[PDB]
Amino acid sequence: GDWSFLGNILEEVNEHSTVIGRVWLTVLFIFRILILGTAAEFVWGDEQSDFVCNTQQPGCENVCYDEAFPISHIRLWVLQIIFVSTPSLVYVGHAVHHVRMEEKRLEGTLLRTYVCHIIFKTLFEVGFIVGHYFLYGFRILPLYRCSRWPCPNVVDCFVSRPTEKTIFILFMLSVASVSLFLNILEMSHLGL
């Protein structure tokens, strides 16, 4: 995918962001967007094609893959990145608006907006982490047993690349936890 527009706006907000905030944005670019592009998308590329079920029943593989993976992991991470970035977009928009007003003519209302955006980032990060956990836990097993119609009885289905997917799941979970910790540091640093 093409993240150029998002990257441009995030670069814009870097100028008006705290040091911790700049660390957060660079982490976002290097350890989330770049990982999905260079590494994860290739891992998940053959998710359905190499999904195999031990049956002669038409449509069983499709329904079972859908049940096993309601939403693909890479897609969920895309959404997580976008929603997490959106508060920064709101903040930079507010700042640019203030600048344009000054042209017509981090304190106070602007500072409060910054803190609010940090809070929203934290909430979205926790929400996506919890959602991933309930969806998949954090370990993808090779065997999925499926009892969804049209499959006759329970059928054994086998996932592609489960170990590598587990590795990247855990990597992204760690990155999200790091980003959350950075946000906590931002709040503490503002407090100081």
Ligand X SMILES: CCCCCCCCCCCCCC(=O)OC[C@H](COP(=O)([O-])OCC[N+](C)(C)C)OC(=O)CCCCCCCCCCCCC
Contacting residues for 154 by C-beta, under 8 A, at least 6 apart? 145, 146, 147
Stretch that binds a copy of itself, among 78-86, 115-123, 129-137, 177-185 (CB under 8 A): 78-86
Closer residue to a copy of itself (CB): 52 or 126: 52
Binding mask 131-170 for a copy of itself (x = CB under 8 A): -----------xx------x-----xxxxxxxxx--x---
Choose the contact partner of 72 out of a copy of itself, ligand X, none; CB within 5 to 8 A by kind: a copy of itself
The overall longest dimension of the chain from CA atoms, in Å, is 74
Give yes or no for a contact between 162 and 140, defined as CB atoms under 8 angstroms apart: yes
Query: Residue 154, interface with ligand X (CB under 6 A)?
Result: no
Query: Residue 116, interface with ligand X (CB under 6 A)?
Result: no
What tokens were used for 14? Answer: 């870097």
Task: Pick from 51, 114, 124, 168 the residue near ligand X by CB under 6 A.
Answer: 124
Give residue for tokens 């979970």: 173
Q: Interaction with ligand X in 17-76: which residues (CB under 6 A)?
A: 68, 70-71
Give yes or no for a contact between 180 and 126, defined as CB atoms under 8 angstroms apart: yes
